[PDB]
Amino acid sequence: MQDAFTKAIVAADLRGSFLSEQELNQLTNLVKESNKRLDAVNAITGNAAEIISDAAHKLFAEQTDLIRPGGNAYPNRRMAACLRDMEIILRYVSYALLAGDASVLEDRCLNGLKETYVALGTPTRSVARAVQLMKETAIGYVNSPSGVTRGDCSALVNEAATYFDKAAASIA
Amino acid sequence: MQDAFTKAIVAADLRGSFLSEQELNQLTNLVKESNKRLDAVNAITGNAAEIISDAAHKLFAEQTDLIRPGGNAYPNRRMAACLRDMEIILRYVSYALLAGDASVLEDRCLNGLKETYVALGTPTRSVARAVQLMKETAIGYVNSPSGVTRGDCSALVNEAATYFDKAAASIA
Amino acid sequence: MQDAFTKAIVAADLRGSFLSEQELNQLTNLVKESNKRLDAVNAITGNAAEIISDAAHKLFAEQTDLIRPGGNAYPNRRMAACLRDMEIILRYVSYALLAGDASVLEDRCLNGLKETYVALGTPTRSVARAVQLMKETAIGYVNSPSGVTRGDCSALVNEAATYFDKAAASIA
Amino acid sequence: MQDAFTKAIVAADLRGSFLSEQELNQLTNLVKESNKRLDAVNAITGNAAEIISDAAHKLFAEQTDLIRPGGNAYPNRRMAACLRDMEIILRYVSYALLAGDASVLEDRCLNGLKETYVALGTPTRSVARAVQLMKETAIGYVNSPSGVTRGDCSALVNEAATYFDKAAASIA
Amino acid sequence: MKTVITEVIASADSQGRFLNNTELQAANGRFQRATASMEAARALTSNADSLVKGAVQEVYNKFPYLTQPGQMGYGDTNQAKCARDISHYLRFITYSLVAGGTGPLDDYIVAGLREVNRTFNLSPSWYIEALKHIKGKVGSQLSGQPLTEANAYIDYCINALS
Amino acid sequence: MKTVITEVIASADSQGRFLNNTELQAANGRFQRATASMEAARALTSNADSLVKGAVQEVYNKFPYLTQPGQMGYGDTNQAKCARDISHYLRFITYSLVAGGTGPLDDYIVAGLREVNRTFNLSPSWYIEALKHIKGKVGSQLSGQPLTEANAYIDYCINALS
Amino acid sequence: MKTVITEVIASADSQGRFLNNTELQAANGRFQRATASMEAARALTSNADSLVKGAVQEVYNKFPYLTQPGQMGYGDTNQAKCARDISHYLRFITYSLVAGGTGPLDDYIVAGLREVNRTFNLSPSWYIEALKHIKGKVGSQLSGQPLTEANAYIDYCINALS
Amino acid sequence: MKTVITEVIASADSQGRFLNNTELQAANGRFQRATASMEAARALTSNADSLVKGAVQEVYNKFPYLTQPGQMGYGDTNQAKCARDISHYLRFITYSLVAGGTGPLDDYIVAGLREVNRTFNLSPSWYIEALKHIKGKVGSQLSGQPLTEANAYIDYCINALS
Amino acid sequence: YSAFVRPADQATADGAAQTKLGITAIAPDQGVELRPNFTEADVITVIRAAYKQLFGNTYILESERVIQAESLLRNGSISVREFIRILAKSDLYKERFFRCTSNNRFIELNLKHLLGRAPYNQGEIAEHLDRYCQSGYDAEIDSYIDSDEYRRVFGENTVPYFRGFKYQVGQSAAAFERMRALYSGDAGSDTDRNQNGQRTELTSGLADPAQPVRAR
Ligand SMILES: *[C@H](C)[C@H]1/C(=C/c2[nH]c(/C=C3N=C(/C=C4\NC(=O)C(CC)=C4C)C(C)=C\3CCC(=O)O)c(CCC(=O)O)c2C)NC(=O)[C@@H]1C
Ligand SMILES: *[C@H](C)[C@H]1/C(=C/c2[nH]c(/C=C3N=C(/C=C4\NC(=O)C(CC)=C4C)C(C)=C\3CCC(=O)O)c(CCC(=O)O)c2C)NC(=O)[C@@H]1C
Ligand SMILES: *[C@H](C)[C@H]1/C(=C/c2[nH]c(/C=C3N=C(/C=C4\NC(=O)C(CC)=C4C)C(C)=C\3CCC(=O)O)c(CCC(=O)O)c2C)NC(=O)[C@@H]1C
Ligand SMILES: *[C@H](C)[C@H]1/C(=C/c2[nH]c(/C=C3N=C(/C=C4\NC(=O)C(CC)=C4C)C(C)=C\3CCC(=O)O)c(CCC(=O)O)c2C)NC(=O)[C@@H]1C
Ligand SMILES: *[C@H](C)[C@H]1/C(=C/c2[nH]c(/C=C3N=C(/C=C4\NC(=O)C(CC)=C4C)C(C)=C\3CCC(=O)O)c(CCC(=O)O)c2C)NC(=O)[C@@H]1C
Ligand SMILES: *[C@H](C)[C@H]1/C(=C/c2[nH]c(/C=C3N=C(/C=C4\NC(=O)C(CC)=C4C)C(C)=C\3CCC(=O)O)c(CCC(=O)O)c2C)NC(=O)[C@@H]1C
Ligand SMILES: *[C@H](C)[C@H]1/C(=C/c2[nH]c(/C=C3N=C(/C=C4\NC(=O)C(CC)=C4C)C(C)=C\3CCC(=O)O)c(CCC(=O)O)c2C)NC(=O)[C@@H]1C
Ligand SMILES: *[C@H](C)[C@H]1/C(=C/c2[nH]c(/C=C3N=C(/C=C4\NC(=O)C(CC)=C4C)C(C)=C\3CCC(=O)O)c(CCC(=O)O)c2C)NC(=O)[C@@H]1C
Ligand SMILES: *[C@H](C)[C@H]1/C(=C/c2[nH]c(/C=C3N=C(/C=C4\NC(=O)C(CC)=C4C)C(C)=C\3CCC(=O)O)c(CCC(=O)O)c2C)NC(=O)[C@@H]1C
Ligand SMILES: *[C@H](C)[C@H]1/C(=C/c2[nH]c(/C=C3N=C(/C=C4\NC(=O)C(CC)=C4C)C(C)=C\3CCC(=O)O)c(CCC(=O)O)c2C)NC(=O)[C@@H]1C
Ligand SMILES: *[C@H](C)[C@H]1/C(=C/c2[nH]c(/C=C3N=C(/C=C4\NC(=O)C(CC)=C4C)C(C)=C\3CCC(=O)O)c(CCC(=O)O)c2C)NC(=O)[C@@H]1C
Questions:
Q1: I170 at F interface, C-beta within 8 A
Q2: Residues C12, C19: contact at Cβ < 8 Å?
Q3: Coil vs helix vs strand at D125
Q4: What atom in ligand 2 is closest to the CA of residue B63?
């Protein structure tokens, strides 16, 4: 796989050099944030079931047809899949968030996904929509926890967003 | 898979409706013919070996080269394959005939068949020919049996033909 | 595998003889009962879930320990297994009932079941108990259905019993 | 698998009780030693290759026959095995040492080992000997490291021993 | 999709052999029965609606609290859905009668049943009642084999739900 | 052994599911047919002998040279065997009618047919004639469905032999 | 059973390599955290009972009808069970805190959760409330990391239940 | 590449489950340690060169004959290479400290070490000395945990080489 | 509201049952699946596993290991089931783990190495025995990985696992008993090189009438 640290290494390797002092200071700082980083992840995982449940409800209220005969979320079998999918994407996103790198998400999850969806006749648009719906709910938790020391998580929040968005984009 | 009944269902499903009374009456009558339908199938299966044997003889009387060194049916090994193939196709056709639907035949059997033949360098034309040869012999039995209650099987006979022909066409 | 018909055949084979007229009349009558036979099976399958559910409740009311910490049905994971098992046994029994022969049941389901149970440390006795509990409930349905033409099912009822019992015995 | 913590849990479970305060204090203290515990492991892993190399030399100086034609360590093939084996055992021992529990070692490593050795014709006694040879060398490192804060590791040292010995015993 | 006809083909196909007498016998069975099956379907199809109303209703009697505010049974949207859903179950049942196999049921309703229900917190119980109530009504309009068939399928779901 | 009943069980078993309506429908088919099947068996069983004589005989007419010295058809031992064998074929056929499946045939006759025949240099052709001649005779004593059934099975062998 | 320590061993074992620095780092993490974990456990263990009462109770407020005759919540046996069960959940949670892994939870509670619940018609919902109510109480007796830990595990179940 | 963080993800991923508390604990460990790790790297990076010179040198003292004509240690090209190589080892070590895992080492240095060395007739021994000499020097510039970390990794290679 | 809980009598627990059989985590199996983008390490771990599962758990020397099959995994172009086909088509497996043991022996051991199950019935063992002369050995092993259930579970991109010693569907009796015989202790492994040569753990005698009994 890859993650923030490993990445920087790899770059350095091809130059053939020891790590730049500048570059260390990226990682040094990254460390400092860890604690924040972690809690973020924890928040997602903790609320997982809900995040999904929620997003779904809203997805189906919007695009009624998906659940109607002839739509893509009908019948049960399909419905199930659609739920499962959302979850998966989420799972990955989380992973990334911890790693501090998109890769894992892109490689295992997003790669080829669009085409699959196309071949099946799944409407890519709707999938993307769902991803966002999820995003917002998720951030909701990340950003409003209880019993955590109060401070600024923005930096992490935005990175979270980006991950969701890469997802949305590549699916769409 | 699919067959006549299942099919009608599926259609109805996408409309989102119960089966129309009109539509039932298609199936109701289809049932009535069963007995005829069955015997037809029985006749094929009963004579199977022969049908093939026969068709082959005629195939090779026509296209002498197939059996000559450098041809496609030479040597033994190849010959064997060619016989086997014919049989298979037949097998499927039968299946369809029972189901009351092309699908099974198309999906399991015909799909990709042409391409195979191409890749091998098997002359698609000749294959098609064989299929017909078979067709005629087969009908021969379907239509002239022993101990069966005398009646009109035409309807079934024609449907049989069609199946053979879909085969011929998609191979060719 | 085996069943009532096949069985009689096999016997006849070893004698080297055509079937006795007497012997035919066993099978002839067996046929007549079919309809009854079938409904019996149908009743079990129809109520399956319940039969089990019921039996379990009673099993655990009796042998409190099984469900207590350190017992064999504790914790959840184990519990699950124990339920699953009961079901299986039932499933088989049904099979037999249709066939009109113990064999199927004996071979796939019963043979070496005891030993398994032993190796695991599961108390064979309790298993057997459950089987009976099931038996009684099952018969309950077989014998008291709704919308069926009223007549005598005893013959079948008893044969059902026997199957259950072979089970009980070989487990125990 | 199992380890010190998990173990205590399991015990508590069968009693059907919450963890004793007394019992917590076993684990609480166990934690405190962690740092020591860790370094111990680190020392083994760090010296691994050598520990073995060493032990072997001594093993073969003692039991000359093993390396002579007809012996068990001859020819190369066998020799290799014997080396590999030693290593494995070691590997496990280490694992245990970290876990704070014999189990892991007993189950994966020692279980069935005697019987294997028997079937092969390997002289169990010699194997045991090797294990000890290893033990002593290993302790050597555990107990005399460089750059570590000075303190008492005896407690750990002895537990280490025991693991080695369980090995020796069950093989022998 | 699992029907008598499809299966025998499948089995024949797997072994790699022509449909022989064995299978045809089986098929014949399906066709003979159909006459009864078909009848049942015509009966359900006609009374659909009325069955649906009755069922939905029942559920509420059985579980009053559902109709209270803040619950699932509350507010028309949900009621509409509840209706729709049961319609579906029925729809499929008819299908299955006609197809002469559980197939239709399996693929639409059963497969993925659990997870759907879990994620939306639909209690199987409810559906069940619906069905039972139905079964009871059906037990008047039909009789003999037609009836028997109707039951089988209805139940099959009960069992799948539970 | 392959009969209708055994198969559905098998299929049910593989999937790991209870016998549902689907399979029972199939079974029913087998049972309804049996009445005809059974009749046919009673007819063959009775005329057995006569059919056998006629067949054996036929074969010799068809292949005169067999009866010449130094051939297979020659010398009583061989004739006895020839008789025996055909008896068997018949025997099994009856069985299969009753069992309601090809099963009996498959396991006794068909499986390993080729190699046996190869190693002892029995020409399939012969048997075939026997059968055909039989089929022709049977085509008098029987009628309607009973007949149809008889044929199916007889043929099934022809096809297996060839 | 899944704890930090067991896993790294497992991973090390699979690859067939000694525990190197990589794994130890991980282990160290578990140990540092333990101090907080341990604290939490001591707090839950002590107030156990009171938490249990409160939860059970809550459930009934949330779902009044349960206490009505002919329901599940009704009649002492059931109440006893209900109590027992929740106790368990709690018990395990403590365990898991101490073990430093979900392991204990997974193997006792989670594995087979669904089917148990299905066959006995226990609605996950109930348990959930119990937990939530608990979580709320715990959110007073504890603070900082100790708290955080407590939550994690409690939740983990919520998610498994739902 | 194997680091703490990557592994837990991997394991989580395989099972198909979310990262739960178990893994996070592990991660936390990695992060706490990093501060020491990072320090060590800064120290090695700075003194690199000097360490390298010293090592190369050492090797020659240890194995005088290498510097004789017709040997490997002889002629500048070889000396240059020898230097380069050790630089590499060092480089990677730093990497690994920072990455918080053996990963970097494994993939660059270790995998395929043997065969390379065999085909070019590089004696592991040599490298080893280099390392040891290094380790000794490092044992001055560093202290406490920073040191400990440095060692671990240095060794890990010794073991891989031997 | 008694909330009598109590230690109970037996006090078996989760763990004790399996330790009694001695599975020590062989019965529980965690499948390993390859990915189109994978670390070389991830390929290594797969190779590691593959070797064990299909081999006796016997020692494998670097010389023994076939590098050409290992090459290609990194590349792609070899399905992991096809990778596993290359092994056993290997001389290594045929000359050792095939020659010594009787036809019955390797059938059971294949059926173990390639699939967790021990053989449910005498007839299916016989089916492969029909093949021995019927067709070339390579076909018969090919037939196993080509068999449906190999495909059904861990069909593609998955190392085979000893799913035996848990409930698998359609296990005709003595699943556990036979498997108990066929798996020694976790450390213990079938040995190409062994005293008394190599004989079938499972009694030829049985496979129909009784459950097997074997040293553990
Ligand atoms: C960010 C979205 C929100 C937020 C986060 C936040 N957390 C901390 C500090 C800590 N958080 C943890 C949590 C963990 N560390 C671990 O090792 C684990 C896994 C076992 C967890 C769950 C820890 C230990 C700390 C340090 C001590 C403490 O929290 O008291 C901060 C403070 C800054 C820092 O980086 O230390 C912040 C801001 N707080 C919010 O309100 C945000 C919405
Ligand atoms: C016979 C009428 C003619 C003929 C056929 C022929 N076929 C092959 C080889 C193959 N043909 C097939 C057949 C099928 N593949 C499928 O998927 C299906 C349906 C399930 C069929 C009908 C395939 C796949 C092969 C390749 C593998 C095989 O063993 O068959 C050959 C031999 C090819 C070769 O190069 O040896 C032949 C000859 N060709 C003739 O000469 C006839 C006109
Ligand atoms: C059609 C190609 C030829 C023909 C057929 C024909 N068949 C019947 C009637 C029946 N045929 C069957 C046969 C089967 N039913 C089964 O269940 C099976 C499998 C065991 C078979 C093989 C049956 C049972 C019947 C009903 C009774 C009977 O045999 O008469 C008819 C009569 C009309 C009808 O639709 O039933 C006919 C015409 N006859 C021809 O002239 C064609 C050459
Ligand atoms: C339930 C009535 C009693 C009980 C049973 C029980 N069984 C297990 C575990 C297993 N049971 C089996 C049995 C089977 N193998 C087969 O071939 C068949 C059908 C022919 C069956 C029914 C198997 C294989 C297992 C082991 C693997 C698994 O657990 O899935 C348990 C669990 C105990 C354990 O640790 O394995 C139990 C509880 N015990 C009770 O509590 C009841 C009295
Ligand atoms: C015995 C425990 C119970 C019982 C059964 C009973 N059934 C019948 C008759 C029939 N039952 C069926 C049912 C089927 N036949 C099939 O083909 C299938 C598969 C699709 C089924 C499920 C049928 C068709 C009949 C014939 C008509 C009828 O329903 O009566 C009887 C009558 C006697 C007999 O069949 O010989 C009886 C007695 N009756 C009892 O006492 C129990 C309730
Ligand atoms: C025992 C056999 C010998 C010994 C050990 C010893 N260690 C410490 C203290 C520490 N050891 C470590 C080491 C680790 N902690 C980790 O997290 C890891 C993995 C990344 C390791 C390798 C740490 C961090 C400490 C704390 C600081 C320190 O080094 O002192 C002590 C001090 C007492 C204590 O309880 O920690 C001792 C005695 N020292 C010897 O002389 C023994 C032969
Ligand atoms: C009736 C007893 C209760 C009720 C029903 C109800 N259903 C939903 C939501 C869904 N219902 C289904 C069920 C099906 N959809 C299908 O496609 C099929 C198979 C053909 C079935 C059986 C599904 C899939 C859903 C999920 C989302 C959706 O349907 O759009 C709800 C809403 C729950 C929510 O939170 O969204 C309700 C309320 N209504 C009542 O009043 C009863 C409690
Ligand atoms: C009759 C058309 C011709 C004939 C036949 C004949 N058969 C054999 C030998 C065998 N024939 C069979 C056939 C069967 N035996 C069985 O058990 C079964 C299945 C129930 C069948 C169908 C077999 C197995 C043999 C080989 C062993 C044996 O001795 O029976 C012979 C003798 C040839 C020899 O060399 O042994 C003959 C002559 N006899 C004729 O005159 C016809 C040409
Ligand atoms: C509380 C909200 C509800 C309640 C509980 C209740 N439970 C049962 C039965 C069982 N409860 C469990 C749960 C567990 N058993 C375990 O081993 C574990 C893990 C440690 C759990 C969580 C189990 C196993 C059962 C089923 C078997 C049994 O007999 O206990 C019942 C009785 C159900 C019955 O049909 O006998 C009840 C009532 N009681 C209430 O009032 C709420 C609805
Ligand atoms: C120094 C201890 C001795 C020495 C060095 C020397 N090395 C080679 C050749 C190679 N050494 C390596 C080492 C590396 N190359 C890499 O890419 C890596 C990992 C990043 C390492 C550690 C390799 C791969 C080679 C082979 C390729 C090459 O030779 O360029 C030589 C050359 C030997 C020859 O050409 O036969 C030498 C001389 N020489 C000394 O003075 C010391 C004894
Ligand atoms: C070395 C100190 C002594 C020694 C070793 C030795 N072992 C074997 C053969 C085997 N070793 C094992 C053991 C294990 N299996 C495992 O999985 C593990 C770790 C969990 C171990 C340790 C096995 C199964 C074998 C069989 C290998 C095979 O069949 O190829 C031998 C060779 C004997 C043989 O004929 O194979 C030897 C030499 N024996 C000595 O002589 C030393 C005293």
A1: yes
A2: yes
A3: helix
A4: 43
In order of A47, A116, A123, A124, B1, the CA distances from A120 in angstroms are 31, 6, 9, 10, 18
Q: What is chain B's Cα-based Rg? A: 18
> In chain I, which residues have their Cβ closer than 8 Å to the Cβ of A110?
none
- Residue B52 near residue B83, CB atoms below 8 Å: yes
Query: Nominal resolution in Å?
Result: 3.8
- Stretch (H or E) spanning F5: helix F4-15
CA G138 vs CA A48, G150, H20: distances in Å: 21, 8, 20
- Up-side HSE of residue I209: CA atoms within 13 Å toward CB? 4
Over its C-alpha atoms, chain G yields an Rg (Å, rounded) of 18
What architecture is the C1-172 domain classified under in CATH? Orthogonal Bundle (1.10)
Strand partners, I158: I33
Looking at residue H69, what DSSP letter applies? T
Q: What is the DSSP letter of A105?
A: I
CB-based contacts of A134-139 (< 8 A; 24+ apart in sequence): A134/A51, A134/A52, A134/A55, A134/A86, A134/A89, A134/A90, A134/A164, A135/A160, A135/A161, A135/A164, A135/A165, A135/A168, A137/A50, A137/A51, A137/A54, A137/A55, A138/A44, A138/A47, A138/A51, A138/A90, A138/A93, A138/A164
Helix axes I40-54, I80-89, angle to 10 degrees: 50
Provide the chain F residues 3-42 that lie in CB contact (below 8 A) with chain I: 13-14, 16
How far is residue C79's CA from residue G111's CA, in Å, rounded to a whole number?
10
| Biggest distance spanned by C-alpha atoms of chain A | 61
Structural domain boundaries of chain C?
1-172
Dist. CA H39–CA E85, nearest whole Å: 64
Checking chain B for breaks where C and the next N are over 2.5 Å apart, the residues before them are: none
Residues F4 and F27 sit within 8 Å (Cβ to Cβ): yes
Q: I28 preceded by cis ω (within 30°)?
A: no
I62: alpha, beta or left, given left = phi > 0 and alpha = psi -120 to 50? alpha
First to last CA, chain H: 23
Alpha helices in B16-153 (DSSP H): 21-62, 76-99, 103-104, 113-120, 124-143
**Structural domains in chain G plus CATH codes:** 1-162 (1.10.490.20)
For residue I26, report the phi and psi dihedrals to the nearest 5 degrees: -80, -40
Interface contact I13-D13, CB threshold 8 A:
yes
If phi over 0 gives left and psi between -120 and 50 gives alpha, with beta otherwise, what is residue A148? beta
Tokens of B12: 């109805």
**Technique behind this structure?**
cryo-EM
